[PDB]
Design an enzyme around this catalytic site. Structure first.
Site, mmCIF file in Angstrom:
data_model
loop_
_atom_site.group_PDB
_atom_site.id
_atom_site.type_symbol
_atom_site.label_atom_id
_atom_site.label_comp_id
_atom_site.label_asym_id
_atom_site.label_seq_id
_atom_site.Cartn_x
_atom_site.Cartn_y
_atom_site.Cartn_z
ATOM 1 N N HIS B 122 0.837 -1.176 0.000
ATOM 2 C CA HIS B 122 0.000 0.000 0.000
ATOM 3 C C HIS B 122 0.887 1.245 0.000
ATOM 4 C CE1 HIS B 122 -2.879 2.914 1.745
ATOM 5 N NE2 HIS B 122 -3.839 2.101 1.340
ATOM 6 N N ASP B 199 2.860 -4.305 8.061
ATOM 7 C CA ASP B 199 1.584 -3.636 7.823
ATOM 8 C C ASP B 199 0.491 -4.694 7.908
ATOM 9 O OD1 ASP B 199 -0.791 -2.615 6.801
ATOM 10 O OD2 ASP B 199 0.169 -1.557 5.131
ATOM 11 N N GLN B 202 -4.840 -5.272 6.882
ATOM 12 C CA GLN B 202 -5.798 -6.189 6.272
ATOM 13 C C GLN B 202 -5.746 -7.578 6.888
ATOM 14 O OE1 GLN B 202 -8.278 -5.670 4.313
ATOM 15 N NE2 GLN B 202 -7.761 -3.480 4.052
ATOM 16 N N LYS B 225 -11.031 -0.411 9.843
ATOM 17 C CA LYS B 225 -11.154 -1.656 9.106
ATOM 18 C C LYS B 225 -11.471 -2.826 10.011
ATOM 19 C CE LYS B 225 -8.209 -0.260 5.411
ATOM 20 N NZ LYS B 225 -6.786 -0.010 5.077
ATOM 21 N N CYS B 363 -4.655 2.580 -3.838
ATOM 22 C CA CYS B 363 -3.457 3.103 -3.206
ATOM 23 C C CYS B 363 -2.331 2.088 -3.311
ATOM 24 C CB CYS B 363 -3.699 3.475 -1.741
ATOM 25 S SG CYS B 363 -5.252 4.250 -1.324
HETATM 26 CL CL LIG Z 1 -3.262 7.097 -3.063
#
Ligand SMILES: [Cl-]
Ligand SMILES: [Cl-]
Lengths: 405, 405
Positions: B122, B199, B202, B225, B363
């Protein structure tokens, strides 16, 4: 006219009991209570209209994006910014000051320059500039205080010079309630080609604010002190300055293009300074907060609060050994100490009566040092506070003096 | 067992109508809907328990401070951190990555060093490291992709060397649904004395997560999220690293002492990285979100979502000219394109049926470039999504192909 009884009816917390007794919340300067118009606006957004914003073409996302940028427009009108594109969403006053100090400070303050703050500043308006002066090798100069809690304005000739890049100054002191002559100070700072950041965290809820009339270069305030949600604030920057500033946080929604072989380019202003998912719940709530405060009318709030303040100062005259700090025309707050009793103790006794006042250094240790005390008590008198509550504060201080003297 | 019907009953948005038709929200990867347990927890905090936190001795302030640090403890248990003092509250994944990149990056990445990210990252996990590599004169290396959306793990020998300070890698791809072999990659990166930031934006909503078992040095995710409020996220850092990192934002509630003549000193970890008023409303809501997700049980969610995913992939086989991107065992999302039709158009037609899917680059422009497309469609299949909704997606794509082919 203002009807404090009808206002209080909008605030569900004000019916709370503390320690068996009914609450007297006298600490809105630390954070303000919120009307159910604000609480429910956020709640109804989560309940019926929630989506990610800016990216995405589906309906909820487009309608949420509309709501967000409408709040940016309403905020820009609230403080009379020329353009909504001059407003950046931030977490609050403290992130807003850090954003200027890094994005603008790092590229306009060279070694050998100087920045002017004041002795009455909140820590949010001290620590960022100390960090900047350490990074670039500049000097932090301080406008000193008078005994009455006003600025020693006659020291400005010796603080300002050609090397003065920035004045960072508070609009209203979160401790003393002093309101600083911002219009004239900005004139002087502009004569030396210095910009002015204004900390307006304690102003925007007490009377109208007009950044075009002040001609400030940056202005910052916080949602949660404007009867709004936490986690949201506004940073205002003159269009011409903002377009020249580089990004601070990097990530999605502030790029134009991302390449792992040809580097990355930034989008245009406001949006270049807003990385990742915005606090959409906070923005919606801040927007309701601006709607609510505008409906009462800031000039009506200013009058009701000015009369309550006068009533309080008058009543406190009958508290023995009470020391007040700050000017006679203070806005919003009363800073005090009771005889030789430590503020922590006085605050504990008032909390035992169900009266919430602030105690400690109020994130203004230099101010405490100037008055050669470690702590003070601070009572806030905001638009939903009553003469009845002022009386409970006065009685309580009297009882504390009798008990402890 | 999991009962998606009872779950959906907690989510007031799911009863919404879009464009005259009932909503099928297939975009939880961009942001998730929130149950009224989360919405009301925040609302009831504003309604009955609101005050400023940490400073202040009165009752509401002390009880709000308790609530905040209890959420820090519950979060630390959710991801199995050894200590709650290893968790920092941030606005979300993007601020958390920026905080590490500045606080830790600037004092541990020298000119001539290199950082490794991956081609599937991302933008939140690219732009901060590009900014850091530009500040210090280091090189950003990239783990490339295979056609199936997995990492070309055989390139690690040529990317890792003695100068490798940091690997920054995604746990689950917000686009392809790939889950990366984090345990083994962290072993390798640790053999070179490199730290790993993960990260996990998700991951944390799809199966349990154990940062002690991963031995990651930093981990970040976002409240919104995880079925939670916006404007709040968690940054986890190993105790020993976190105690060595310098502050990033400066201001109140992260000082120990502020002096205008002898400089300023910082408080201890977590709190040194949290300046100004925290997002108390967000923290309370995140805490409810963790309570809600834990009550359903992540392993139950993982099973329901795994079966829905299988059902979808199976049904989509009957969509003509459908191109899928990513591995067969994807989690959470399906990335696709319909024949030669642009994703923006396909998403518009699906939104016209009341089906919300994501479209664009998500993104993740480098990922789009690797697959030599400008955009893709992304459909999320989360714990509150149904086989019925999968069918509407499939029918809709069929109708779009008939109409537009
Ligand atoms: Cl973006
Ligand atoms: Cl402080």
């Amino acid at each position: 006219i203002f009807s404090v009884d009808k206002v209080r009816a909008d605030f569900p917390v004000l019916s709370r009991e503390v320690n068996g007794l009914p609450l007297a919340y006298l600490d809105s300067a630390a954070s303000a209570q919120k009307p159910s118009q604000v609480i429910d606006a956020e709640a109804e957004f989560y309940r019926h209209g929630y989506a990610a914003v800016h990216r995405g073409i589906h309906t909820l996302s487009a309608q949420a994006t509309e709501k967000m940028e409408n709040v940016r427009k309403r905020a820009s009108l609230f403080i009379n910014a020329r353009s909504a594109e001059e407003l950046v969403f931030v977490r609050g006053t403290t992130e807003g000051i850090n954003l200027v100090a890094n994005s603008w400070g790092n590229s306009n303050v060279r070694a050998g320059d100087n920045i002017i703050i004041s002795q009455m500043e909140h820590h949010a308006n001290i620590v960022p500039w100390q960090m900047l002066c350490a990074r670039v090798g500049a000097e932090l100069r301080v406008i000193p205080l008078n005994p009455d809690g006003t600025l020693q304005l006659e020291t400005l000739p010796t603080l300002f010079d050609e090397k003065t890049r920035l004045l960072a100054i508070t609009h209203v002191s979160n401790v003393l309630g002093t309101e600083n002559p911002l219009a004239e100070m900005i004139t002087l700072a502009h004569q030396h080609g210095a910009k002015v950041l204004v900390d307006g965290a304690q102003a925007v809820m007490h009377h109208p604010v007009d950044v075009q009339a002040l001609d400030c270069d940056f202005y910052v305030f916080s949602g949660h002190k404007l009867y709004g949600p936490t986690g949201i604030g506004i940073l205002y920057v003159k269009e011409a300055l903002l377009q020249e500033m580089p990004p601070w946080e990097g990530g999605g929604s502030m790029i134009a293009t991302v390449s792992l072989s040809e580097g990355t380019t930034w989008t245009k202003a406001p949006w270049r300074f807003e990385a990742g998912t915005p606090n959409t719940g906070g923005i919606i709530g801040l927007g309701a907060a601006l709607e609510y405060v505008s409906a009462l009318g800031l000039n009506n709030i200013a009058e009701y609060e000015q009369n309550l303040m006068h009533y309080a100062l008058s009543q406190l005259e009958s508290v023995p050994d009470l020391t007040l700090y700050g000017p006679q025309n203070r806005l919003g707050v009363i800073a005090f100490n009771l005889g030789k009793h430590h503020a922590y103790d006085v605050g504990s006794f008032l909390d035992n009566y169900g009266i919430a006042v602030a105690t400690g250094h109020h994130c203004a240790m230099p101010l405490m040092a100037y008055y050669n005390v470690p702590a003070m008590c601070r009572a806030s008198l905001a638009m939903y506070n009553t003469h009845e509550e002022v009386d409970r504060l006065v009685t309580g201080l009297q009882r504390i003096h009798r008990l402890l003297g």
